[PDB]
Amino acid sequence: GVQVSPSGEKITHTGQVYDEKDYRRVRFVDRQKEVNENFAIDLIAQQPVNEVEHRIIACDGGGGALGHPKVYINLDKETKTGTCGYCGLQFKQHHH
Amino acid sequence: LGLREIRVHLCQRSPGSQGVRDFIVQRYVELKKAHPNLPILIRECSEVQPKLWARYAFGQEKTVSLNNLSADEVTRAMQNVLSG
Amino acid sequence: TSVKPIFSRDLNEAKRRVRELYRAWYREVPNTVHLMQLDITVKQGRDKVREMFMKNAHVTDPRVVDLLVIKGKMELQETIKVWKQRTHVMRFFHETETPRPKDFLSKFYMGHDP
Amino acid sequence: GGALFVHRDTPENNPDTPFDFTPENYKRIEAIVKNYPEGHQAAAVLPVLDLAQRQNGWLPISAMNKVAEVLQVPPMRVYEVATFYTMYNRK
Amino acid sequence: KRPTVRPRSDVTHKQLSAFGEYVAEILPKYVQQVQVSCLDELEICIHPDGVIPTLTFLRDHTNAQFKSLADLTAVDVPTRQNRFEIVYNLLSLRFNSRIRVKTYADELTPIDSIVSVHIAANWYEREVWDMFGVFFFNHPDLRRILTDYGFEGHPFRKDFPLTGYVELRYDDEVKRVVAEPVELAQEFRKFDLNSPWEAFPAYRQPP
Amino acid sequence: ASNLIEVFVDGQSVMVEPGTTVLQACEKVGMQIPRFCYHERLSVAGNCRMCLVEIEKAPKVVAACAMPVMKGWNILTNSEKSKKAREGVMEFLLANHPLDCPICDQGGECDLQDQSMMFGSDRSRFLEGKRAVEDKNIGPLVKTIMTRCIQCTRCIRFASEIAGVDDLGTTGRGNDMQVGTYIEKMFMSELSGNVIDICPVGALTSKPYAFTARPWETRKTESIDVMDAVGSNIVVSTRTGEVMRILPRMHEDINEEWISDKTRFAYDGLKRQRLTEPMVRNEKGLLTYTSWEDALSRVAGMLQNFEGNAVAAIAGGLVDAEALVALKDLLNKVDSDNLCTEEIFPTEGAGTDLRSNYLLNTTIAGVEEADVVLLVGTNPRFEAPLFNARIRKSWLHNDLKVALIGSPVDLTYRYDHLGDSPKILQDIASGRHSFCEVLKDAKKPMVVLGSSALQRDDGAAILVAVSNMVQKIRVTTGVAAEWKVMNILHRIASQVAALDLGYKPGVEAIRKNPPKMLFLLGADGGCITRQDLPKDCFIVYQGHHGDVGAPMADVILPGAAYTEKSATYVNTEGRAQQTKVAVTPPGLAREDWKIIRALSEIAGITLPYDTLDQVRNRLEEVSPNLVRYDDIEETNYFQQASELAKLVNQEVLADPLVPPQLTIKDFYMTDSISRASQTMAKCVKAVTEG
Amino acid sequence: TQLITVDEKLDITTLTGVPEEHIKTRKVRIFVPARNNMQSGVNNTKKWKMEFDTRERWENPLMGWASTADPLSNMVLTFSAKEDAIAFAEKNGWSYDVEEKKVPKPKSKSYGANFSWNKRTRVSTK
Amino acid sequence: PTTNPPTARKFIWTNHKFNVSATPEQYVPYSTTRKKIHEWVPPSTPYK
Ligand code: SF4
Ligand code: SF4
Numbered sequence A: 001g002v003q004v005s006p007s008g009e010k011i012t013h014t015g016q017v018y019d020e021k022d023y024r025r026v027r028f029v030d031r032q033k034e035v036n037e038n039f040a041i042d043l044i045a046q047q048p049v050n051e052v053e054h055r056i057i058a059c060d061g062g063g064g065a066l067g068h069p070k071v072y073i074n075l076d077k078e079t080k081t082g083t084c085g086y087c088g089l090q091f092k093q094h095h096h
Numbered sequence B: 001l002g003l004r005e006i007r008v009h010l011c012q013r014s015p016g017s018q019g020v021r022d023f024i025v026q027r028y029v030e031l032k033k034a035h036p037n038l039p040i041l042i043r044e045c046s047e048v049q050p051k052l053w054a055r056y057a058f059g060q061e062k063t064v065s066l067n068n069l070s071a072d073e074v075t076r077a078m079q080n081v082l083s084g
Numbered sequence C: 001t002s003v004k005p006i007f008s009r010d011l012n013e014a015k016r017r018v019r020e021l022y023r024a025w026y027r028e029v030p031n032t033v034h035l036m037q038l039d040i041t042v043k044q045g046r047d048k049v050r051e052m053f054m055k056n057a058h059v060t061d062p063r064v065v066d067l068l069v070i071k072g073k074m075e076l077q078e079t080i081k082v083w084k085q086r087t088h089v090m091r092f093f094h095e096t097e098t099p100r101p102k103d104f105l106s107k108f109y110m111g112h113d114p
Numbered sequence D: 001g002g003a004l005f006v007h008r009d010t011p012e013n014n015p016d017t018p019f020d021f022t023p024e025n026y027k028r029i030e031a032i033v034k035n036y037p038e039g040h041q042a043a044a045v046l047p048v049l050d051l052a053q054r055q056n057g058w059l060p061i062s063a064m065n066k067v068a069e070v071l072q073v074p075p076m077r078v079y080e081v082a083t084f085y086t087m088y089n090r091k
Numbered sequence E: 001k002r003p004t005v006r007p008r009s010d011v012t013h014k015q016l017s018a019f020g021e022y023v024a025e026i027l028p029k030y031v032q033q034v035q036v037s038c039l040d041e042l043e044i045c046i047h048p049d050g051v052i053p054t055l056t057f058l059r060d061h062t063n064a065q066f067k068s069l070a071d072l073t074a075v076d077v078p079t080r081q082n083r084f085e086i087v088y089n090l091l092s093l094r095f096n097s098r099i100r101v102k103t104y105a106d107e108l109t110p111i112d113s114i115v116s117v118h119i120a121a122n123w124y125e126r127e128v129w130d131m132f133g134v135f136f137f138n139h140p141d142l143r144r145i146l147t148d149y150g151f152e153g154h155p156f157r158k159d160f161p162l163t164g165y166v167e168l169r170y171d172d173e174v175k176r177v178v179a180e181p182v183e184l185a186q187e188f189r190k191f192d193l194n195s196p197w198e199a200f201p202a203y204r205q206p207p
Numbered sequence F: 001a002s003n004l005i006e007v008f009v010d011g012q013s014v015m016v017e018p019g020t021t022v023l024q025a026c027e028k029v030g031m032q033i034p035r036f037c038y039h040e041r042l043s044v045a046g047n048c049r050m051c052l053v054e055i056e057k058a059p060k061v062v063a064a065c066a067m068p069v070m071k072g073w074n075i076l077t078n079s080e081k082s083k084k085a086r087e088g089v090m091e092f093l094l095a096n097h098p099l100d101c102p103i104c105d106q107g108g109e110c111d112l113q114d115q116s117m118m119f120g121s122d123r124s125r126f127l128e129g130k131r132a133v134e135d136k137n138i139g140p141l142v143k144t145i146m147t148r149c150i151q152c153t154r155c156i157r158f159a160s161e162i163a164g165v166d167d168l169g170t171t172g173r174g175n176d177m178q179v180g181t182y183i184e185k186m187f188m189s190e191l192s193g194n195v196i197d198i199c200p201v202g203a204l205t206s207k208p209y210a211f212t213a214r215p216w217e218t219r220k221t222e223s224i225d226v227m228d229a230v231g232s233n234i235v236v237s238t239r240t241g242e243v244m245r246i247l248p249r250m251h252e253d254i255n256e257e258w259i260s261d262k263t264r265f266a267y268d269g270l271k272r273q274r275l276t277e278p279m280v281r282n283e284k285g286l287l288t289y290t291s292w293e294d295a296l297s298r299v300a301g302m303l304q305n306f307e308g309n310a311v312a313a314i315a316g317g318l319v320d321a322e323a324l325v326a327l328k329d330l331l332n333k334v335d336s337d338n339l340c341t342e343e344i345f346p347t348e349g350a351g352t353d354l355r356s357n358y359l360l361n362t363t364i365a366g367v368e369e370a371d372v373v374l375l376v377g378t379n380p381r382f383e384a385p386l387f388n389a390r391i392r393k394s395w396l397h398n399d400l401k402v403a404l405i406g407s408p409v410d411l412t413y414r415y416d417h418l419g420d421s422p423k424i425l426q427d428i429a430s431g432r433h434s435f436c437e438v439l440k441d442a443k444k445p446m447v448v449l450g451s452s453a454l455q456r457d458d459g460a461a462i463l464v465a466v467s468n469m470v471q472k473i474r475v476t477t478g479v480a481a482e483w484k485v486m487n488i489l490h491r492i493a494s495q496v497a498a499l500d501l502g503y504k505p506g507v508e509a510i511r512k513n514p515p516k517m518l519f520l521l522g523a524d525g526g527c528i529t530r531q532d533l534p535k536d537c538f539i540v541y542q543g544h545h546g547d548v549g550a551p552m553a554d555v556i557l558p559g560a561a562y563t564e565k566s567a568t569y570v571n572t573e574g575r576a577q578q579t580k581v582a583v584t585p586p587g588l589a590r591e592d593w594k595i596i597r598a599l600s601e602i603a604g605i606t607l608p609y610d611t612l613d614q615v616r617n618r619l620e621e622v623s624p625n626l627v628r629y630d631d632i633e634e635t636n637y638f639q640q641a642s643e644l645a646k647l648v649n650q651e652v653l654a655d656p657l658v659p660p661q662l663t664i665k666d667f668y669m670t671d672s673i674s675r676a677s678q679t680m681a682k683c684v685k686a687v688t689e690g
Numbered sequence G: 001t002q003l004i005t006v007d008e009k010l011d012i013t014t015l016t017g018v019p020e021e022h023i024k025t026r027k028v029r030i031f032v033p034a035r036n037n038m039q040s041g042v043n044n045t046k047k048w049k050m051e052f053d054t055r056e057r058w059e060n061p062l063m064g065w066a067s068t069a070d071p072l073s074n075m076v077l078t079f080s081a082k083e084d085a086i087a088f089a090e091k092n093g094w095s096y097d098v099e100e101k102k103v104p105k106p107k108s109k110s111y112g113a114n115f116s117w118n119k120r121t122r123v124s125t126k
Numbered sequence H: 001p002t003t004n005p006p007t008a009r010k011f012i013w014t015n016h017k018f019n020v021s022a023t024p025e026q027y028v029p030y031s032t033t034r035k036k037i038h039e040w041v042p043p044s045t046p047y048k
């Protein structure tokens, strides 16, 4: 989420914020600091694991030519979950 | 005087520096026995005119060429340096 | 050691040309401080002419000298005619360029530049 | 798949799993090794490994490690063999 | 027949090669290394002492009526001792054919002008002078054409930085536009893009 | 005539030695044949089958990586059959390759991409489903993504033949062949990061450099390494004034294509615990930030009020010859000659008067000519790996026989362990040790001693005993008078330059006559300490990190690092090698010799040189071996040094001389740049855990 | 227009508009770029390069981009030989430190060595 | 959009804003990066 610093400046999803002693905060005087309140990491964490009955699943994202290149994910390690490299969707072998 | 270092420059394969190599092999041993705590540096290089740098106190250096000498001229120059 | 000459077969004729050019500039400076309404005197202009001339005093090849004279005549044309404004003329004086010192130690205090 | 070609430790299949050759298996191993030149004794890997399989019925990681220790071979040179040949039962 | 490759006709190659032999044996005193390309284009390289004779012959001669000077360029190749490769692209309306004549120059090795032949070359030679530093002879008015009125340097030389050495701004103190040494907020990013694998074995340079 | 044979490459003829391969000949005429499995330093393997060419009047195609060249063979590199073979192999390689290029750190520098664009087709007729492989986890340095392995076996052959681990292989067969280990096992050797360099397809990548850049962005600066004293050649990739990684260079004499993990992964320390501003003590005795003028004025005052034998300097290991010579000139102009190092070399005897006594006279490439090698008090593995790698290469190809007087270690190769105590030296010399038989029947032996052995009190005794042994060796075997048997291996970069400059090695003179104004240049090892020096001793510390010497300082002059300056560093052989500037120092940090010249000018002193060429002319004056870059100067005065050193009445202590780096957990953190690296800490935490 | 006796070393500084700074205080580097070990291609190790000394790069406070006061920060020239580059440098008035070309040494290679009766070339990884 | 409406997505805004130049609630640019190089933290104790 958008947490603030001891100076009140908001910490972006990059972990960036100016130190209290930094002079570069005048640019935000009588103005605002533009941040994106929808952190993609928390969002993609809020999504569930898509189970599958096949040991090797593909992921194009969604929409076909509107998603990402089709990659194939192995799901042998039953403790871990396979994560697409383009999107962050997780997949798990249903029958292990 | 205030002598601190003697550093000898010469070549490994060249005539001009032939006097310094003979001098070394024959007398550097005895001379470094006589003066044990005095640096006597030999930094032989390639295609370098041979020289003898004697640097005295308060960073003041001398230089006397040794191109195309014998070992005896070298000995005399070195002892002249030592004595002063 | 054998090459083709541009104009001068020796440095003396190139020096003759250089002197002609110096005369032209020395005679022109007043007319262009009058016309361009420059806020400098006539002595500053001629000192600047002499300085820009000495800037290339070290040359010994007559071809470099001939090309420098050609460039100087080009500039003198651009100036005799008012093709260039007071801006380009006062560019020579560098009234705003903070003068970097030649003291090793100041160059050391400000920056890593040698 | 079923033939994974990887090994993730478990209580049944770990290095501490209790494998060891019998005093008869050791003499059979000595003979086998003797069937090859003196400098080349890393060629008994296959027969010694199938022997261990016969004694134990199957092949746990400790079995391969002990085969290596006996023949003084790297255990990966035995993992490769076991995975490559199908007669070797790793479950 | 193949739809992606480009249809190639040898007839133009032959025509241009024959005309190149013509030019070479009619101007031996100047001609060097005539050559024709896979794409049908004739290139006649010469000694700069031959500029005016060659161009006048190609303009006035009957079997060669190249009387329109399309372009006039230069090419900096710092490797060779004579860097600048001056190029004369020409056109014959009578034969619907083109041709290219090339010379070589240096910082201190000027050549002759052809305004006596093609008046179109006044500004092109002024451009060559302003951009590369090549000086021409017997030019009516040889000055700068494209650069600023007090510009030092010849920017198309490979040794000249893309961004130059100075930079302009307005100073209220003097109330004028002044020139200060360059200083950028974002430095141009040099991308090394050449693939390390030979791409065209027909142009391989033997060691 | 000398067994050469004539062969053609598209008509062009070339004469090649027998055993030469088609690939080497096509190279000898400037043609580079495609490759995915041949690497020029690894056993041949005809796996990728991408090297396929046709031979004139021959039906099928041969593997140019493995087929030796026969007389009169004409090799058609650009014929239809060769092209179609390449296209087929590319179809096959890319059939199961994942669409990962835009998340693959190898993008832009992938051999698969370039070879597909230059030798393969532009289409895919694969209408099936690819495969996938569960990624391994072999440590914190190498990231494994094995859907991208093209099973070239380079990693395996490198681990086995060059590193000596033999823990990587191929599990399974067929299309489901899984390169890697069969069990979870960290592949943490000291030559592990090179598997990244030889994996062409991004399966193996640097975890630090992960995602941080792309090759076209980087600007490549050719420099050298300083963590060791080998002088490994490296390329420093930068991206908008920031070091992105360290990548090796090629030098067949030193570091053919390899570098240690400490060298390529400890660049993360240059981004941490850095001195960016001159500091000085306040009235309370705390370190505060101030200017250059103020600190240099303080130091110049203190220097003005002191003279010889009360001033002293100390170098640390990451120092450059320019700073050393400048500080020496300064101290000399204030009459001091107590210039010392932190590393202990014995001056007993000839000392630094002769380079033969503190160099690797049998240069690194000399291990390839040798027949016997004897290691004394060294673990060259953790102390100078590339040297150990060369010894292993010889042990492999030239059947080299190694021996070691020291504590038993692995070395990645097998060796004859004689003993531990240094009394084995007298027994090897006087002719009573078993090894004497080998030694007598040998033709080209070379002994190599470790500075580590010279740190203990008996360094001079070990040295004189080794001299005796070497002399008797030369006498018995019958060496050719151009073969150098006695060598010394250093683990500290600046040492050889300091000794060539006249520095008196070791800090003994300081302890003897302690100073009142100590200079502390790069020294962060902790040899001296205020408990050993007068009270109120003015200490000024130069450097680039704040590890050890800065906390104990009264002034701090922030210097530059090796990626931040141009500098001459000399290696164990005497090969002067120059660093180049990839980045500028941070904040108000500066070149060291620059700092010292400004210090002098502020004082009444003034050194003559205002530039770097002048400093290097001074170097030429003092020692002209420091300017002959990339060159090694022969030195042939060992006989005299031995005659001289046969006259010291010291004996060894019989204590078993053991090296300080006994395992790899004692290898990743040895200097400040390494101790300030989070990556080397990750490495230690991986190795100690398991 | 016959020939002329110059008899001196070439000097082009005065015709290039290059400031005294970037002629006196510049050290050129002449070298053959080293092969990138991430790749086995050897086609960029053929032509000689000319590269200038690196100078400061400071973050821009506004965005955080890299700034310079060095026009020649990205100057790269390509030559076919070493003498050509040295001549260009001398001509333009620069100081240069040359670096010889590094060619790999020819290497004996045999696929049988991997299979030996008595040597250590015998590999265990086929 | 009253007949063919857009697709619903969480992250999409529910209140459109106009051009907010020369106001507060405008855009000011800044570095989204953290510090690259870290300085040495001097100790709080003196050498005595
Ligand atoms: S992991 Fe890389 S180096 Fe190893 S076999 Fe696969 S492609 Fe080759
Ligand atoms: S290894 Fe090469 S081809 Fe494969 S994903 Fe990476 S960049 Fe693309």
Ligand code: FES
Binding pocket: F034, F035, F036, F037, F038, F045, F046, F047, F048, F049, F050, F051, F052, F063, F064, F065, F066
């Ligand atoms: S290069 Fe020959 S099979 Fe790989």
Ligand SMILES: [Zn+2]
Binding pocket: A059, A060, A061, A068, A084, A085, A086, A087, A088, A089
């Ligand atoms: Zn996806």
